[PDB]
Amino acid sequence: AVQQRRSSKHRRDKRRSHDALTAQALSVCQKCGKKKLFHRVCSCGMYGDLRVKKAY
Amino acid sequence: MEIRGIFGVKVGMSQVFTTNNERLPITVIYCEPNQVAGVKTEAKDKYSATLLSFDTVENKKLNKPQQGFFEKNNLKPTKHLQEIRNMTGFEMGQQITPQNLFQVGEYVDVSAISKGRGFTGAIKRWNFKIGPLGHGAGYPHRFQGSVQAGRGGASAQRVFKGKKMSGHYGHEKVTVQNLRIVGFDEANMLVLVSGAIAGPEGGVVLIRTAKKKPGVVKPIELAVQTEKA
Amino acid sequence: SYINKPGKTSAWRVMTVRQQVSAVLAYGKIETTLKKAKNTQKRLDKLITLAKVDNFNNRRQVKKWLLNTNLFDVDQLMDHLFSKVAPKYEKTPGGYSRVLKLGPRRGDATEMAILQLTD
């Protein structure tokens, strides 16, 4: 393991171009009508009607 | 030599005693009569073979193109298909009765996909040696170490091409020959075959006439345990 | 290796499983990792099913899986389970508890899930 110079600038960005974070495909909520995300809980808390998450 | 073929799934490993003071592990392969997808006579196809479909699934679990070709060819929706080569004597909608097309004693070959192993060491699939297991010096016991190609001014000052390094090990469709035939069960359309088949128990098993021999029938070695009280 | 934190061990895992199953029996809702929820629910439902035979042999058999809490203790937990929790669960052949997947945790971005017991 050894290197004899420093890295470039564009290739450095290309290496960091593969470091993109994960994406999130949102989903609509029929339980309450607010924003939500797929396979997760809603904002109000209702799930299969079963309201389970408290806002406060 | 029109090499007949048959598909199935290996659904068991057993051991059946035979003659000549020996026992032979006899596996079982289960399948159902398949439906031919088509035939190829070599004039522009560049080879002669027969595409056969199998693993029939229900209609709502298949894409429109393939299933549409299936009903247009008088076939049911199937999950898989493959071409058996050097064999074209098919007719349309032929239900596969393998116990008649294959006798009880020929030496046949079997193709199957192996069990996947991912990224493993080099002692498997290449069969090399490892470092010092003991003897009390340092802490190496399994490594490659020497990968020398040249160390100097112009000896090689590079590396060779082609690596005997295991990639995604396992799950490769390979054909092994010299498998004998043992018996048949028409009730379940199952075939008892000498020797286990590669891959997970239940994987694809293709049985065809072998190339090492043109098919030599051997008699059944009578060792059935009819010894009751 | 030199002296250090041993990470996580099977004994620790089973002890944590016992801790959470006793806690959820005490209250009825526990937040955790989904993997741990799947690990715990097997023993949880097996024990609930065992509680429906209603004999002292079951009382002996279930004793190696109960821990105390601030509100209740092992004896109180087992008596409550045998008296009121079990008679409700005679109308379901398994699937006694429910796990609901929440959002990621705010400390390590871990998939969180809340496990509760509802008939």
Place this chain on the structure above:
Amino acid sequence: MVSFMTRLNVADNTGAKQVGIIKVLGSTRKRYAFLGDVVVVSVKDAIPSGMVKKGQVLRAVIVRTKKGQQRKDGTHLKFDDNACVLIKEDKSPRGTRIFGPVARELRERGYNKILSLAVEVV
């Protein structure tokens, strides 16, 4: 599998006590010690009353193996001890009153000289 330098007692009535392998007859990386395999031995301990010099390099045939041997008939004959017989110049033993059983795995190779007088063949 027994490798080398192993000590074993005698079975045929010859008059020796301890013997050790001096040359394993076979091939490179044989790594197997099945029965009926000829081997070259040296008598590590021969009392003077016997007919074999102590340390005489001679030919033996192993009839018992503490390692064992997996039978392919579906049965399995296993020995818990290592024993052999000293063959004199073709296949015949130097002992007469055979003591202990002998395996049938060497019957396929003949050796009727030993098996015509042994106690039992298994």
Place this chain on the structure above:
Amino acid sequence: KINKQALIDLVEQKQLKAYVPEFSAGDEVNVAIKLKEKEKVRIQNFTGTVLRRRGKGISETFIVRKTTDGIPIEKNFQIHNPNISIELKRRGKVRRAYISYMRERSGKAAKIKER
């Protein structure tokens, strides 16, 4: 399509036996084995105590040890095997299905044998 895995046993209806008594790993039995050299066929009544009684239907193997000239000779046989006759002699009591400590047992030092 479906693999019931009952076909494992549905094909075993050929290699089975019903003459073998149900014994344990602490019982003394005997078995006659033929030795056919094309004439003067011998019969070996190999007898002794069992050290393992286990099987899965085709894996029904068992180990039996005899003492000849002081030498303990142990042989294993599959239940589904031609040219055997498993004749039971006496049944003791054992706690495990595979034991190996009795090879050190000798006369006036063996375990108590059940009637």
Place this chain on the structure above:
RNA sequence: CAAGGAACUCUGCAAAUUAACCCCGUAAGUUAGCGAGAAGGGGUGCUUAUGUAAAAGUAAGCCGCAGUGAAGAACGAGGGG
């Protein structure tokens, strides 16, 4: 980790076994101290009764893979400087 037991090399270096207590036994040499706890062998669990201040122990019986039962215990012998 079945089996080989130092065959790998200068290669017995971490590697196993002997251990606590109790009862025999212990070679050569010795300047008479030793060697020596040489080396080599055997027992320890439970119950009953006896011992005693208890202690081990004692006699009878019991079991199984064991009975310092887990955690704590010495490998050496011979030749040369």
Place this chain on the structure above:
RNA sequence: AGCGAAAUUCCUAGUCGGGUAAAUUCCGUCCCGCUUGAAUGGUGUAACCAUCUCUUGACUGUCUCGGCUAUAGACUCGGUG
């Protein structure tokens, strides 16, 4: 005097006996002592050595002949770097 290929021998792997199928490792044996050798003392010596050598019983993953069980790193994820 003593010992002698030495804790030291160019010729040397000198030679003999044995352990060793195999042994400049070990011991003793002879001696043109290149250049051994009594107060930079010798010969041998009684136990012992957190020294080495070889033989021996005992213990083997020491290799035959590979890994196993689980973690710890490792690898993805989030925070710092």
Place this chain on the structure above:
RNA sequence: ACCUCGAUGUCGACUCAUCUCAUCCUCGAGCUGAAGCAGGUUCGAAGGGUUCGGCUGUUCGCCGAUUAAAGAGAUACGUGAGUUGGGUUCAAACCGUCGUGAGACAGGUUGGUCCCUAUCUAUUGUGCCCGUAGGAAGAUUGAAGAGUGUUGCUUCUAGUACGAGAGGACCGAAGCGAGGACACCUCUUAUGCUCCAGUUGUAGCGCCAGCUGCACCGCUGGGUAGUAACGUGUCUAUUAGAUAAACGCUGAAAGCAUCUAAGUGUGAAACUAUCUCAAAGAUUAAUCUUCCCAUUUCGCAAGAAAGUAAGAGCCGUCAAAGACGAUGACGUUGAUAGGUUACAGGUGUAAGCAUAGUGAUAUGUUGAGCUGAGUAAUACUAAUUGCUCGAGGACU
């Protein structure tokens, strides 16, 4: 002393081998003061193999043991960004020799400081997006590649021939071998630490019992699925071609002979395939099949709302898959995983009661109890009623 002194780690031991043939054999053949077997030289000739020990720091060197075989050369006398260092290029302690002397002995016994978190090219497998050119889903193939290209004994033919006899075959057929590959771990092994059981101390579960923690995980014996091997099955062939060594045929130069001048066949373990496997980013994008698409009017031309419907993807369950990706099935109409029950299979008569026992305890209840993976029913639980890219022959 040409090139490196502002380094370009040199003996090893080790795993891996690679290249050459001026080869040891497995090959074929020529000839031989080759009666035959057993032979010897040479030719074409590198596909493959060419071991296990002690001894010397030592790959140098001795012999031991076999096999058809224990061949030689080059890789920094191969490989310390691969590991300890045994002499040797750290020290010294001691013997001997020598210098008047600090000290030298390339003589001798002993010990003896090996760091590197992988940047780029090759590189093992997969990936982000894109192309395969109306869109999408498949089926293919074979330019070029890889493995396979190893090999002995016994029996029959055959003690037949030859040779007075001894000695004693070359060919072919079968079995058995060795190494290696491939598969499964049905049998057996180590292992299978939230499985069971024997099982002791201590301290907890109110106490006796029956549980619990630690004692490796208390030790020990087994064991579901499953890993691997020492577990068991196969294979090294046949065939189309072709020169090579050698024999040639007709046959001239050189009125014949003469393999050569035209072709011809016999024709090497070697060569190309036949055997097995990936493969069109193989842009030489090669070949084929299927499914889908039809709302004027503008805007640098076909979108002004239709904007896949063919499908694929985000996400969850799975998973014998498995560094993350990854591919495959399921997505509620869903048996896709988990659960309840049942089964395979394994552990082993559960606790308690009763009888005898003052009491260690023996028997019945009981083939009872139990378990993480293997199997079956079962929507009992979850994967719900979601979101993104994504239709019109642009061009020959």
